[PDB]
């Protein structure tokens, strides 16, 4: 009650207080069963890429995306993500991927 009134002194009556007495004790993580590394097709390592007038789009489905291997494989000069932060991106699930 003192925290809500922001005063050590409290008068007689009934008060409604903001509820933050509960503290988190554990963290649980639930993601679907997919243990398969992504059939990227080595899209990053592909011998021939698409021309810019006819750009190739590839569907990505039913895998677990790991970018740690890609960073080890090659150093990327430009890595700009919009709408999703570059950090904690590995925590998040992605609905549909069209590279």
């Amino acid at each position: 009650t003192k925290c809500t009134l922001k005063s050590f002194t409290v008068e007689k009556g009934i008060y409604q207080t903001s509820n933050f007495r509960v503290q988190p004790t554990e963290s649980i993580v639930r993601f679907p069963n997919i243990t398969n590394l992504c059939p990227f097709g080595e899209v990053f390592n592909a011998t021939r890429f698409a021309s810019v007038y006819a750009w190739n789009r590839k569907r990505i489905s039913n895998c677990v995306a790991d970018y740690s291997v890609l960073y080890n494989s090659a150093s990327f000069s430009t890595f700009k993500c919009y709408g999703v932060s570059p950090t904690k991106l590995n925590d998040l699930c992605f609905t549909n991927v069209y590279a």
Binding site: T17, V22, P24, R30, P32
Partner: protein, 50 residues
């Protein structure tokens, strides 16, 4: 979706395209657990204010 709270089981039926659901205030009314197909909805640790 990341959050803090308790998780309560429920038997809310869902449409075929989306197992996940949204409430009328567009809050997540229930999100289906990935491994277990049982419907599980978020309930706050804080109930109606004391």
């Amino acid at each position: 979706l990341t959050g803090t709270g308790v998780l309560t089981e429920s038997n809310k039926k869902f449409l075929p395209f989306q197992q996940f659901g949204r409430d009328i205030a567009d809050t997540t009314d229930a999100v289906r657990d990935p491994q277990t197909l049982e419907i599980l909805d978020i309930t706050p640790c804080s109930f109606g204010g004391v």
